[PDB]
Design a protein around this ligand. Structure first.
Ligand SMILES: *[C@@H]1O[C@H](CO[C@H]2O[C@@H](C)[C@@H](O)[C@@H](O)[C@@H]2O)[C@@H](O[C@@H]2O[C@H](CO)[C@@H](O[C@@H]3O[C@H](CO[C@H]4O[C@H](CO)[C@@H](O)[C@H](O)[C@@H]4O[C@@H]4O[C@H](CO)[C@@H](O[C@@H]5O[C@H](CO)[C@H](O)[C@H](O)[C@H]5O)[C@H](O)[C@H]4NC(C)=O)[C@@H](O)[C@H](O[C@H]4O[C@H](CO)[C@@H](O)[C@H](O)[C@@H]4O[C@@H]4O[C@H](CO)[C@@H](O)[C@H](O)[C@H]4NC(C)=O)[C@@H]3O)[C@H](O)[C@H]2NC(C)=O)[C@H](O)[C@H]1NC(C)=O
Ligand SMILES: *[C@@H]1O[C@H](CO[C@H]2O[C@@H](C)[C@@H](O)[C@@H](O)[C@@H]2O)[C@@H](O[C@@H]2O[C@H](CO)[C@@H](O[C@@H]3O[C@H](CO[C@H]4O[C@H](CO)[C@@H](O)[C@H](O)[C@@H]4O[C@@H]4O[C@H](CO)[C@@H](O[C@@H]5O[C@H](CO)[C@H](O)[C@H](O)[C@H]5O)[C@H](O)[C@H]4NC(C)=O)[C@@H](O)[C@H](O[C@H]4O[C@H](CO)[C@@H](O)[C@H](O)[C@@H]4O[C@@H]4O[C@H](CO)[C@@H](O)[C@H](O)[C@H]4NC(C)=O)[C@@H]3O)[C@H](O)[C@H]2NC(C)=O)[C@H](O)[C@H]1NC(C)=O
Lengths: 207, 208
């Protein structure tokens, strides 16, 4: 060290305009003898100076951790702009630059399908709803279950997986009480992806 | 080198009695100066002698590759016996030993549910059938699609995913031509897992 790791914003933050997408530049193994760290940020080479550099906190292996958060514009990230964090310290010989950007490739809209429970699974008290999300590119996506405008607890969403034609797919399944399903509660699968209109679609199901 | 790599049998081979599960011991970086490789095999530390060692095969980097195959008994593998491959070579200072066995943990039976397509997807030329396999342990499993006793291999299956209660889940979905679904062809999801009765279950669906 001192090593440098640069992290992208999360898909939902880049897709919803009210949220705050951040590029996070984490520096570790910053020593006691040479503690000074200078963060220089760039957007397609153009230097920018609005990064909140949080103060260097000590880790119990006796080296400081230093985080610099650059807030990005949603459209810049989505248009494939490159974000470069330049770190400089007296311990390291020459500056460590790292660059990230959105995954490249032509955007493809997800198709979203919901499946009600099996008649066989209705025997059990716990019951499964499935949201199938297919044909999307890039893999950056948010898929979430809700009911009555609130998040639904007991679900799992697998990672996006490549199909043969280059696009991605996943399933999300929600485990609900049989009684909630049988009394007609509406459950919705919300999908956020850059290739959807308004970056958002929702599909609902009920008995 | 030399370097040794030891590979387990595939779940479907361990689970179907007619099939032939094999543990495979591969040696690479075997030199021309010391080409003699001796395999010794052990099952829970007791030496066994039924391995079939293939003749050394020269590679394009001027080293030999030597493979030894031990056929295992299905029940031995499923009972958690340890298979050790011991490789002796003159270039090595001591023999290289590698050991493998089945993933540990209490077996849990998958529940299997099949879901027929969305009426919205019927607009497309292709259609999706979903097989939901949940609550299984260990993650070693084989999930396959078929119709009329023959494989339907245009599917994708998510890797086993860890649930909250310790067990694994996955989905597999089959991409079929719309016409085949509407004609009433029966499609089946076959699941092979050690915790199922007879190591196998099948769930089917068609248009009703
Ligand atoms: C002293 O202690 C230091 C701190 O560690 C604590 O750890 C405890 C367990 C314990 O040990 C304590 O004593 C100690 O206090 C320690 O620092 C560590 O140094 C390591 C380097 O040796 C770092 O390893 C790297 O980790 C990366 C992954 O980081 C994440 O996930 C882990 C957990 O899995 C987590 O610990 C980290 O904090 C980090 O979490 C992510 O954090 C970001 C930023 O905040 C989040 O993103 C933000 O999220 C917010 C909302 O919260 C918002 O959405 C913002 O938009 C967004 O910015 C993430 O959400 C969060 N992710 C989570 C939780 O999952 C790895 O990427 C990295 O791998 C790369 O480098 C390896 C070699 O170093 C290489 O082998 C590997 O292949 C990979 O290489 C890269 O590959 C990429 C492509 O795949 C390429 O693009 C790259 O170019 C390429 N890079 C290369 C080759 O360099 C690596 O494993 C470790 O992160 C760090 N720990 C922390 C906490 O920072 C220090 O080492 C210790 N010192 C000594 C001397 O011992
Ligand atoms: C000289 O040339 C040598 C030969 O190479 C040719 O390759 C050409 C492409 C080209 O380069 C030619 O010029 C060249 O001739 C070359 O040999 C190579 O050495 C490498 C090491 O330096 C080896 O790397 C390892 O590979 C492992 C994976 O191997 C499989 O997959 C690859 C493809 O991804 C494939 O090429 C291999 O053949 C091998 O295939 C598997 O084969 C087995 C046995 O047949 C099959 O199992 C059988 O299947 C049948 C049905 O057919 C039946 O079901 C039976 O039941 C069953 O026995 C598999 O189906 C098949 N798998 C496939 C195709 O995917 C890696 O796992 C291994 O990684 C591990 O070790 C690393 C460190 O050493 C570590 O970093 C890594 O994390 C990993 O760690 C392990 O983790 C495990 C837990 O997850 C632990 O249990 C382990 O303990 C742990 N090990 C550790 C930490 O060490 C590694 O990368 C390479 O395989 C080998 N190539 C061949 C062809 O043998 C040589 O290096 C060259 N020398 C020089 C000096 O250049």
């Amino acid at each position: 060290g001192p090593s440098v790791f640069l992290f992208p914003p999360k898909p939902k933050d880049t897709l919803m305009i009210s949220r705050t997408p951040e590029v996070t530049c984490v520096v570790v193994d910053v020593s006691h003898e040479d503690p000074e760290v200078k963060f220089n940020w760039y957007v397609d080479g153009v230097e920018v100076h609005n990064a909140k550099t949080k103060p260097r906190e000590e880790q119990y292996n006796s080296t400081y951790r230093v985080v610099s958060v650059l807030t990005v514009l949603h459209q810049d990230w989505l248009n494939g702009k490159e974000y470069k964090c330049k770190v400089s310290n007296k311990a390291l010989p020459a500056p460590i630059e790292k660059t990230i950007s959105k995954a490249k490739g032509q955007p493809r809209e997800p198709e979203v399908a919901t499946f009600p429970p099996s008649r066989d699974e209705l025997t059990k008290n716990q019951v499964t709803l499935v949201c199938l999300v297919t044909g999307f590119y890039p893999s950056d996506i948010a898929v979430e279950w809700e009911s009555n405008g609130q998040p639904e607890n007991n679900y799992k969403t697998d990672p996006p997986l490549l199909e043969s034609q280059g696009s991605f797919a996943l399933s999300s399944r929600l485990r609900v009480d049989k009684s909630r399903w049988q009394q007609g509660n509406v459950f919705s699968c919300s999908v956020m992806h850059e290739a959807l209109h308004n970056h958002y679609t929702q599909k609902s199901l009920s008995l």
